[PDB]
Amino acid sequence: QSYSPQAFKFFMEQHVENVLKSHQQRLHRKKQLENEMMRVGLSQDAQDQMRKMLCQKESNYIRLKRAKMDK
Amino acid sequence: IQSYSPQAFKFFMEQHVENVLKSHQQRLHRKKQLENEMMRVGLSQDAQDQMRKMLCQKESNYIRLKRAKMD
Amino acid sequence: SHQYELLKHAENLRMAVMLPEGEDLNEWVAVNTVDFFNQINMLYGTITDFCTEESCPVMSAGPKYEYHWADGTKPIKCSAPKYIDYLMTWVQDQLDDETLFPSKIGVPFPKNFMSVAKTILKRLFRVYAHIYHQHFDPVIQLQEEAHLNTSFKHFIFFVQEFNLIDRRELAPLQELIEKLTS
Amino acid sequence: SHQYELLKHAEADLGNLRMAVMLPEGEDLNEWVAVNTVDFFNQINMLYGTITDFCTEESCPVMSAGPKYEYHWADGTNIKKPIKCSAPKYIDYLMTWVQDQLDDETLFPSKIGVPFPKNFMSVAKTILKRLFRVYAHIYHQHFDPVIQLQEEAHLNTSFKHFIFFVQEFNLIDRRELAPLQELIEKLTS
Ligand SMILES: [Cl-]
Ligand SMILES: [Cl-]
Ligand SMILES: [Zn+2]
Ligand SMILES: [Zn+2]
């Protein structure tokens, strides 16, 4: 199944921008969580729990993106 | 059942309520903004219906991915 | 007497619950149901060391009401943690079902979604009631009163917004619901 | 002569993936490898989709990644005795196979609770190898179309991302990377 060149070009540009942005946003959520969690708290066990569920959510997201659940 | 600490639960609750109100306010903002900008451009009724369909679809999809699971 | 606190930095809640403009009802109900599922899950997770076989020999929401398990497949007289274990496991199995709770975009909800949703919400409320009645002082001492009341206020606001639980089920906490909803 | 045109047109687009290909904090390896593998699969898929009308039986009578290297199809239980195939036929078999691998709920789980199989990394590495074979064939035989179609930058960026990932996790041996090592040395600086 052949694609037109303009389509592919667009896909690549959009994809690269998407990858870089998604990476940056991931790191941003991690840092944000760490900062707010550090600000008015808290035990270390709690930090471990929150980090665990967050990482689980991220992995789930990239799994859904892998599963082409966007349609 | 898996035991979470109190500090974790509290933190999550505090963060979550604020998130709920924020998401609500943002949703209404996107809807109103779309209505105003589309009214400004001056568009057919079919076209406005189309744009609203796409926005509603994007929102519904958004909360659907958020449901299981998203970050 | 006894103030119910509530939190704090924000509370809209009512507004928060309302079905958005042109949003599918089933999707909204689904999302909120999942959220409340997690909330109640870790909520009961904090006081799991107090709700033991000895402390709570039977799933009780006050001396007036007593709950028994049977759905997952002959009602069983279970304790608090065992009953709640069965409950949360069942709901977990419902949420993980790709048929009732679609993960894909194009996939629509079944016609009987609202039924199992209302069932889920009933039972989750049963958990709320049990925590509020039997294991409430630990919640106070853990300083989770504000969070528990806020969660329950949100839950009740949602349920009432869409009439997903009969008042006959809400009976064990009606005295509280009347107070929180003002 | 192909090496010098390829190394002339190396400069492409208008960022740094080297940080983005890295396994994020507390992320499962298999999931990451899977996601990037599927992604690169799509990329190379529509990429070859662009120059498929130049890649005909006559233009490419045999699967060649340059005069030095020639690939043969095999390593699948069905269709197991190696076949001397042309560019479009070999690439068809390849991408179809990889497609069947990705669509398998056993190797690449779609549900949340479902875990990866024990031999996942192996078939992942196989897939990535073969995808690189496609990359090499496009780079060597059908490069002039890429130039005239002005897809050079996008091709180089896709290949750069692929190589960055592969090198980041050592998923392809250099023996397979041989037909394009001269380019890899340049892109990775
Ligand atoms: Cl029942
Ligand atoms: Cl092979
Ligand atoms: Zn109990
Ligand atoms: Zn060819």
Residue numbers in the entry:
A (entry chain C): 631 to 701
B (entry chain J): 630 to 700
C (entry chain A): 23 to 33, 40 to 101, 105 to 213
D (entry chain B): 23 to 36, 39 to 213
Paper text:
Furthermore, our complex structure between the phosphomimetic form of MOB1B bound to the LATS1 NTR domain also displays a similar structure to that of the pMOB1A-LATS1 complex. Intriguingly, the phosphomimetic forms exhibited stronger affinity than the truncated form, implying that the phosphrylated N-terminal extension contributes to stabilization of the unmasked state. Indeed, a loop region between the H1 helix and the phosphorylated Thr35 residue contact the LATS1 NTR helix. The single phosphomimetic substitution of Thr12 activates LATS1 binding, and the double phosphomimetic substitution of both Thr12 and Thr35 induces further activation. Thus, phosphorylation of these two residues should cooperate to relieve autoinhibition by N-terminal extension.
Phosphorylated MOB1 protein is switched ON to increase the binding affinity to LATS1/2 and this binding accelerates auto-phosphorylation of the activation loop, A-loop (also referred to as activation segment or T-loop), of LATS1/2 kinases for full activation. The phosphorylation of MOB1 occurs at two threonine residues, Thr12 and Thr35, located at the N-terminal extension out of the C-terminal globular MOB core domain, and is required for binding to LATS/NDR kinases.
